[PDB]
Assembly symmetry: D2
Homo-oligomer: 329 residues x 4
């Protein structure tokens, strides 16, 4: 069985701890975090040791690591763990700077490391079923993709300043989803953006409401709509229109009931955020990773996928600034 070390014991870390513990072929061996209480919290809940990042790098009883530390640490930590011969799962992003990313990937290649990036949406049972429908020919040739993502609320200002901006922090999942759904590469990005929700996000130099169109060489188009706040919860919809039809995945909620009164028919709001919306996705993610470890199996999403997504995000940022379509090729 595959022995895991977890780095980062915050929201994202907890979600991965659960997934690892839930997986029958995986053992969660140690946790590390800057805040010791935060690693202890997970150590208790799951019965694993607390350790330093250094110690996990050094330990021969760690086959793989899961990196859920802050954004600034990622590229460094991947390189370190690839040097030490660990299989690596790293949460988005590899880095905010595309050149730093390329450097980090050279190391992975040179060390022959297994790296999976965290685009968890590719492992959602619902979104997977959309992709399998496309693969089975149910909608013919893909033509037009529509992706709408709305977070329940914006992060605080401090996270925004470090985050790399909405396109890189939020829209990046959707850029990856567009690549996942289209079946081929976007070669052009045009984007609009505004600050409609909270001035303070503008003051920090970010946007909170963005719209994007990507186009491939064959003309297929993907439209992305993003908003940092929705009162009804975590909006996560995909839709693909094709020559033979369309396929969509509806929004998920934790509980599905309906109450009818003179005021109408009411169903509950959506999941608060990724923690509960993507529980099954996290389990499928870890399982894929394990298959990619214990067998020599194709890793996806790869380091190449994290870069391509950032490339689109960078190209969107510029599109907004230069008020025009930005080539990628």
């Amino acid at each position: 069985t595959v022995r895991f070390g977890l780095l980062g014991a915050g929201r994202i870390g907890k979600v991965h701890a659960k997934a690892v513990s839930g997986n029958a072929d995986a053992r969660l061996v140690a946790v590390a975090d800057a805040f010791p209480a935060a690693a202890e919290a997970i150590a208790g809940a799951y019965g694993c040791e607390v350790r330093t990042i250094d110690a996990i790098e050094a330990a021969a009883d760690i086959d793989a690591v899961v990196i859920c530390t802050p954004t600034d640490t990622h590229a460094d930590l991947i390189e370190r763990f690839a040097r030490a011969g660990k299989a690596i799962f790293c949460e988005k992003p590899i880095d905010l700077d595309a050149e730093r990313v390329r450097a980090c990937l050279k190391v992975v290649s040179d060390t022959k490391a297994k790296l999976m990036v965290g685009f968890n949406r590719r492992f959602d049972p619902h979104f997977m079923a959309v992709r399998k429908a496309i693969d089975d020919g149910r909608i013919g040739e893909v033509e037009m993709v529509t992706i709408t993502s709305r977070d329940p609320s914006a992060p605080p200002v401090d996270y925004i300043k470090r985050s790399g901006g909405i396109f890189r922090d939020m829209t990046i999942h959707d850029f990856d989803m567009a690549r996942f759904l289209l079946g081929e590469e976007p070669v052009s990005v045009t984007a609009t953006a505004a600050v409609l929700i909270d001035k303070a996000i503008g003051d920090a130099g970010d946007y909170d409401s963005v719209s994007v169109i990507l186009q491939t060489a064959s003309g297929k188009q993907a439209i992305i709509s993003n908003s940092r706040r929705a009162t009804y919860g975590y909006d996560q919809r995909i839709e693909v229109h094709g020559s033979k039809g369309a396929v969509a995945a509806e929004n998920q909620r934790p509980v599905s009931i309906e109450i009818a009164t003179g005021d109408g028919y009411t169903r509950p709001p959506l999941h608060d955020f990724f923690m509960t919306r993507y529980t099954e996705a996290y389990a499928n993610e870890i399982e894929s990773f394990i298959a990619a470890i214990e067998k020599g199996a194709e890793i996806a999403p790869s380091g190449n996928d994290g870069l391509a997504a950032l490339a689109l995000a960078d190209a969107a940022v510029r599109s907004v600034a230069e008020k025009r379509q930005i080539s990628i090729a």
Copy 2:
């Protein structure tokens, strides 16, 4: 009693006739049409006269006209009937050339004439309830609009050649819808396009699958998605995300049943023909005209709504060709 002349005895003409005839405050006095069998059938159906356009224009027993003739006759007809002192309902568009439309409206302004343009979707009960919800404060401030429209099949190449292209012929309804749903004027347009469905359309100098982002001065965004072909029928969706919540209108189908087997739960496809989808909007549209004549209120959608829609289409054509964001004057 409002005395009507009808110019155009085709499919739409037949509908508007039905509406006018059955309205208690209006009478269909005469019909004019280049197809003499078509004008005769309507005359027989509603016991009114067949007249030439000239006779209807010069007649003293006609208070208003419904213009359902081909697009290239619209501007000229509007000017003539304004000068003759009739009130005018014209089917979209006024003309295809912005410059021509401007000159037409100068004539409507100077004659002080009543002109409604046929943007029927403003009169759809479902879309009207969406706008009403926004008016009632139910979603707070409008932030992001998404509009999806897909026809059940492409037009024939002869129709395409005199249509003025997808942005002017199809998307024009969505541009108006966007203005209807946004609080505000769009001041920028950006667009992508392709020929995904039938190369005969690309040859004829047109696109069949287009995407459009519009932004207002306050930064509000509307996204428009159009496809000329959808095997599942006539797809007409609007959604508006706001600060307090979101509102949307659902697709319509002629019967609401569901059959469940080992293959799944299946509901029928949507309407296979636009006129069946919009039977109520066409009725409300004329009813509203006839009512706005009598009390003599100011009219929407108006000539300028006709122009603004077209200019937005014009900017979309440029935006694709110039691969950049185009500003509205």
Copy 3:
């Protein structure tokens, strides 16, 4: 051209007058009612005559009659017009007393008259589609039928006293629906009942909340649920489970929008009034009556359908009182 007399100028009469007039194969010739002004308002609108019932019965220029007068006149009027050789459409029921109904139908049979009873739900587009799915074999052999009907508001006591009680007045439509969906005769009825909504209904000797199970000789079962009051509107559902799958018809509302907030996703309530739900069914029913006259066609729903549905109501009453399953002779 089928020439009609309308007997009864209340709200139902007005709707039926519309249907007859608008039909290319029918003319509304005369209208009777106990209140002169009611009859005059209809006749005047359709440019036809006010006549006495006696005159319509004697008249050689009347081919068919629509009966919309009070229930206690139906059996007598049907007999009269059957003897007079007119085709007959009668609003339910023939009479509240099954022996009286049997007498009426013997006269109908000896005179070889044509009689349709107004079980308008058989002509609803949605319920017809369900029945067509069954006829086409899409659910295999019918096994289990579930019918739910709930009114928006309970009727006033004076309505109740002349209604024959909930089973004869309300459930009667569901009993006919059951026969229509089962495609074979129920032979047993088991029912329960209560006064849950308004004690005044119980004080008048009636119930407001009832449950019924019908079973056929082959063992197929239909369950019926009825409530006199639902704050969410006029609930009318049918479901049929069969050997290969199941089929259901969904509730109808005036507009199809949805608002999402932190309180959840809310669709509007159902129609608040029954005639608004059944617009098309009333139109189809009359259309189909007129086509059956033009042809020499077999008229359904027939007098016998009227009797069969009442016999089920009578058995339900007795089942409630005697706490047992009642066999239908």
Copy 4:
């Protein structure tokens, strides 16, 4: 503290509880038993617990609680034995098919102050719980009329049918419990109909496969229940409650929710095959509630009396079909 569990029975239902016990943070699966050692071994293999005998689990100091997933004819005796041995007991439905036997069993459970929860897992489903909570919160006013539809993907085999006590005792039993859960009051009368519409071999075995039931309470509230042994579209599990101020319903669940639209229509996937995947959250919540009962001493629901009450409704349904009349509940 950690609750130490012995599992008795390693079939389908046993596997589902193994998973739920395993998945719970406060519990450890220590021992499995089964009459077929391969089946037990398989569960021991996959979870790293021991294969013991039932006698051993009974005598074991290192067992706090048992989950009884053995055949139905062993339930009442096993409950009495583990009650006397001081284990907390979770028992899959039924306690017994015979109400007098159930009564004798509950007397032993009461005399030994044993903790017994019976397996009406539907009460722990997040969707059904939220229906009940909405009713508790007053969102539909006073309950008036309940409608429950349950349809299995396909019928069990004849050998199972013959030892099952028949469709009312074996299938509808869950819906009788659900009706009591939703109504808030006891049914006092049962009237039912039945037939063999699906497979004549069920009828030849003395059972029915398609049944309809109406329950009524003293205040007049009514519950209609519809059951079919076979639905091509999967495991149909719906509840609906009409009240004075509105209605509340839980829709069916399916494993994947997508929609494909073509000229043929808009198609969503079929439902869950069976209880194994439909009720995974419910089985977690149930074990969680059982542990809470063990840890805090809270009174248990679904209790022994709830198992008895559902069986008494089933017995009344059987009589109602045979006698063609409404049967009152003692």
